[PDB]
Amino acid sequence: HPETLVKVKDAEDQLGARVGYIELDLNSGKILESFRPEERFPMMSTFKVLLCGAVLSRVDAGQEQLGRRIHYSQNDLVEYSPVTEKHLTDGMTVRELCSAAITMSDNTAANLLLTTIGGPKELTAFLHNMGDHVTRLDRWEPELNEAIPNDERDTTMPAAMATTLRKLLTGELLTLASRQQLIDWMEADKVAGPLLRSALPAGWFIADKSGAGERGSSGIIAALGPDGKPSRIVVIYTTGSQATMDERNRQIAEIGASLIKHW
């Protein structure tokens, strides 16, 4: 609904920066509303949903096991690894690593998983192969969050991310078991409370993944809907703002409020 585009433009005025937006019908894949659908934006931690979809794809093909344990050391630890820094001695299973990457945005967990699938280059190939010809991962945590103005490295387009999340969650790319596992991880998201979740009516469903990076970059991808069932996908990205994280979050939450109001 155009009233939601009004809030997105307000967001741009408030943040003094570009805001990309997509509202997508989960069932049919129809694009209900959009703003800068085909401009590029840094993915930040939202790429972790894509990463774990690729891991799950390998599991469906029997090339990987959710229960396989992965050991690592101090040399692997990067900034913000809230879960991986605790299990250094025990190591962690692939399953535990995706949970950490998705629900806690654990950076080391993502790098560990990135290695098991062949790194940024293979994630990009996986995406292209499933029909996303624009989304690309080029670096590892934490450099992928650099968001250099105009840098296309580690970016997606709102329209592309939206349909890619749709294929991963409801398409035939993954088995029913994996699709469900991916959305369960996103539903258990623990660090996106200040964003869309803050404007969600009680009783609604939401599986999401947010991100934040340098140069005022923030973002979120999500499958949400009333009556405990997801029925639309919403993607929101912004970069270039001098605004604080709280201010960026308030803006994204307001966009969420408008989408819900005009549902």
Side-chain angles (χ1 to χ4, degrees), residues 60-138:
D60 290 341
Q63 298 169 299
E64 183 58 277
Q65 296 77 59
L66 288 170
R68 185 169 72 84
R69 181 165 305 275
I70 290 185
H71 284 285
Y72 50 96
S73 63
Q74 202 70 219
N75 299 319
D76 296 298
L77 284 166
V78 296
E79 61 171 2
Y80 189 67
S81 301
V83 176
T84 49
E85 66 192 9
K86 279 176 47 183
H87 304 295
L88 196 48
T89 299
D90 299 347
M92 288 170 71
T93 63
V94 174
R95 178 179 286 116
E96 288 168 313
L97 286 172
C98 273
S99 175
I102 292 169
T103 69
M104 297 294 297
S105 278
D106 190 293
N107 279 353
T108 288
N111 282 356
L112 291 180
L113 295 166
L114 263 175
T115 292
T116 78
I117 62 163
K121 195 170 291 76
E122 287 322 300
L123 180 47
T124 295
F126 168 79
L127 291 170
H128 193 290
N129 192 63
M130 68 173 281
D132 189 329
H133 294 182
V134 303
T135 303
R136 58 182 288 190
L137 190 74
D138 303 81

Side-chain angles (χ1 to χ4, degrees), residues 219-237:
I220 187 168
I221 63 182
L224 77 174
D227 305 294
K229 277 161 293 180
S231 46
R232 296 182 200 184
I233 277 177
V234 170
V235 170
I236 308 172
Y237 288 103

Side-chain angles (χ1 to χ4, degrees), residues 9-27:
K9 195 277 178 168
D10 191 42
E12 290 205 349
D13 285 318
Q14 292 302 303
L15 304 177
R18 297 184 300 137
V19 172
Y21 176 67
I22 294 293
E23 190 199 10
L24 193 70
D25 173 58
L26 181 56
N27 171 235

Side-chain angles (χ1 to χ4, degrees), residues 157-192:
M157 292 180 176
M161 176 60 70
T163 57
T164 286
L165 182 54
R166 169 165 185 277
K167 305 184 201 314
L168 286 167
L169 301 179
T170 67
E172 288 303 330
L173 179 63
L174 297 172
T175 57
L176 265 290
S178 288
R179 287 171 235 173
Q180 192 55 48
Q181 178 64 82
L182 186 64
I183 203 166
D184 284 352
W185 285 323
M186 296 184 66
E187 204 180 328
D189 196 338
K190 304 275 169 44
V191 305

